Design a protein around this ligand. Structure first.
Ligand SMILES: C[C@@H](CC[C@@H](O[C@@H]1O[C@H](CO[C@@H]2O[C@@H](CO)[C@@H](O)[C@H](O)[C@H]2O)[C@@H](O)[C@H](O)[C@H]1O)C(C)(C)O)[C@@H]1CC[C@@]2(C)[C@@H]3CC=C4[C@@H](CC[C@H](O[C@@H]5O[C@@H](CO)[C@@H](O)[C@H](O)[C@H]5O)C4(C)C)[C@]3(C)[C@@H](O)C[C@]12C
Ligand SMILES: C[C@@H](CC[C@@H](O[C@@H]1O[C@H](CO[C@@H]2O[C@@H](CO)[C@@H](O)[C@H](O)[C@H]2O)[C@@H](O)[C@H](O)[C@H]1O)C(C)(C)O)[C@@H]1CC[C@@]2(C)[C@@H]3CC=C4[C@@H](CC[C@H](O[C@@H]5O[C@@H](CO)[C@@H](O)[C@H](O)[C@H]5O)C4(C)C)[C@]3(C)[C@@H](O)C[C@]12C
Ligand SMILES: O=c1ccn([C@@H]2O[C@H](COP(=O)(O)OP(=O)(O)O)[C@@H](O)[C@H]2O)c(=O)[nH]1
Length: 436
């Protein structure tokens, strides 16, 4: 039996994609060692059915710990944004423990995420083949990589233009980009990517050309589940079909009080029904739902609005018939889920790869992006406008139509989605066994 150790990045969204990939390799007669911090393994084990206990084994990775950076903060999930540099640094310092795990378990293959250049380095030193699995899309990577080589040539196939807010943000930055691209470039033989050709095919081909690496799509990797929901469904069941937006900014972003004000006033002016997940970082004692929102906002919204604190059953909400839209930060898993369930996206991207994802959503026609003003600020009138058009007044039915067509395409895919990955792993291991 071929054994695979998988090392995701310490983000819930990355962990989620890695587990869905682990299940698929499970079903193709691979044994999976799933390695992350204990706080991350605690958050992900509930998502793994008991049927995989003999196929998927969780392995603990130790990060350096301090009373001020204790193990329960060894994740991006709810992490204070000012601790994100410490988490990246602590993660790199787990290379020694990672090497000892590889020597103890001696897996035949390492599948590693895009945010740990030390991981392929440790694997090569132990003569273990290592493959990058990139849990996000193609579009960002190629849109970012093209202007470095061809600053005077227009990006092919797209009309997307990056807003000056993110062009300044990503102008330290060089070091993180070089680290990110290294984990793709150093992958052996192929890069596995969490995307599908119906959405990004021509960008996958172009990226393979820019990187001089073979790119293998592993498809949309969407988790589908089988306390919170009961109360929420009772509220949603009283609404009209396709009348309600879900509002979420992911697992590792906390909008500013001023950003929340623009989102809230946009929801108010649109008169839509809404369910809004409001989260606070793990150390915040000073913040609350009423304080975080404009005064009187929820009493003006009345029964049109519901605020969920902490965490919501995102997939179940997106699948409810009353959901007509998704006001989302356009994290990659959120985008894949919304297409899988046929829900139009109202893009409010925030940072990293989200502004690119929003561009791709807009280009694919399965959603619309709320544009920021020239200074990079979210605009309550743009949010209200798009919710009105897409959900309330329904003058943008092309977006619903194309999202539903995309969901039928995705629902039609099966385990053949993983044939190309499995054949490339097979070939790589057969070749590396000869070279010893
Ligand atoms: C800096 C370098 C890796 C950084 C890495 O540096 C490596 O680090 C290793 C050591 O690892 C460290 O040591 C460990 C322990 O030992 C750990 O402790 C620790 O964590 C770990 O960091 C060393 O062994 C390596 O020697 C060293 O390079 C770090 C420091 C992050 O790691 C990164 C990797 C990606 C990269 C390699 C690019 C991607 C691909 C391309 C080139 C441009 C030229 C090519 O593009 C083509 O050409 C164009 C025109 O030219 C187009 O025309 C054409 O379309 C296009 O196709 C092409 C394909 C090569 C890059 C854009 C290039 O710009 C430099 C890039 C960012
Ligand atoms: C293609 C790359 C530009 C390449 C170019 O980078 C630019 O190059 C410019 C000039 O480069 C110099 O000149 C050239 C020619 O002149 C070279 O020849 C020369 O070698 C070089 O020195 C610099 O001016 C710029 O500063 C520099 O950005 C190179 C490297 C080729 O250089 C572009 C730029 C922005 C980028 C780097 C992203 C922004 C930030 C993030 C990553 C995703 C992963 C990371 O986000 C993580 O993921 C989250 C989870 O999703 C969080 O959980 C987690 O916490 C978070 O950390 C993080 C922070 C890295 C990106 C979204 C990544 O998807 C693609 C990236 C678009
Ligand atoms: O209240 C919430 C917020 C997020 N999620 C899940 O957390 C993941 C977020 O991943 P994404 O890539 O969209 O954004 P990230 O949090 O990584 O920035 C998705 O699978 C969501 O379904 C959820 O279930 N409930």
């Amino acid at each position: 039996t071929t054994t695979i150790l998988m090392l995701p990045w310490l983000g819930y969204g990355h962990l989620s994609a890695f587990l869905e990939l682990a299940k698929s390799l499970s079903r193709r007669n691979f044994h999976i060692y799933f390695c992350s911090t204990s706080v991350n393994l605690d958050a992900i084990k509930p998502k793994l059915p008991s049927s995989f206990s003999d196929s998927i084994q969780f392995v603990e990775l130790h990060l350096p710990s301090s009373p001020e950076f204790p193990p329960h903060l060894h994740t991006t999930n709810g992490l204070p944004p000012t601790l994100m540099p410490a988490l990246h640094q602590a993660f790199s310092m787990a290379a020694q423990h990672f090497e000892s795990i590889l020597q103890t378990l001696a897996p035949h293959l390492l599948i590693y995420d895009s945010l740990q250049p030390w991981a392929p380095r440790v694997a090569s030193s132990l003569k273990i083949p290592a493959i990058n699995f990139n849990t996000t899309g193609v579009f960002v990577i190629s849109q970012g990589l093209h202007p470095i080589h061809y600053p005077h040539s227009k990006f092919p196939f797209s009309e997307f233009v990056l807003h000056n807010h993110w062009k300044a943000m990503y102008s330290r930055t060089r070091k993180r980009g070089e680290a990110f691209l290294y984990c793709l470039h150093a992958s052996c033989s192929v890069i596995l990517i969490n995307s599908f050709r119906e959405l990004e095919g021509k960008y996958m081909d172009y990226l393979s050309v820019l990187l001089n690496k073979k790119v293998v799509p592993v498809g949309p990797l969407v988790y589908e589940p089988n306390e919170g929901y009961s109360s929420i469904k009772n509220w949603l069941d009283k609404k009209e079909p396709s009348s309600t937006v879900f509002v979420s900014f992911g697992s590792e972003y906390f909008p500013s009080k001023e950003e929340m004000e623009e989102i809230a006033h946009g929801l108010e002016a649109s008169e839509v029904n809404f369910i809004w997940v409001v989260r606070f970082p793990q150390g915040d004692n000073t913040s609350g739902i009423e304080d975080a929102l404009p005064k009187g906002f929820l009493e003006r919204a009345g029964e049109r609005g519901m605020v969920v604190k902490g965490w919501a059953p995102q997939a179940k909400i997106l699948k409810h018939w009353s959901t007509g839209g998704f006001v989302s930060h356009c994290g990659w898993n959120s985008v894949m889920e919304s297409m899988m369930f046929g829900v139009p996206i109202i893009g409010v991207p925030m940072h990293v790869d989200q502004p690119f994802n929003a561009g791709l959503v807009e280009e694919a026609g399965v959603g619309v992006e709320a544009k920021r003003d020239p200074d990079g600020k979210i605009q309550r009138d743009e949010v209200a406008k798009l919710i009105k058009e897409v959900v309330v007044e329904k003058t943008r039915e092309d977006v619903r139509k194309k999202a539903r067509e995309m969901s039928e395409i995705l629902r039609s895919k099966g385990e053949e989605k993983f044939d190309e990955m499995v054949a490339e792993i097979s070939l790589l291991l057969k070749i590396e066994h000869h070279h010893h």
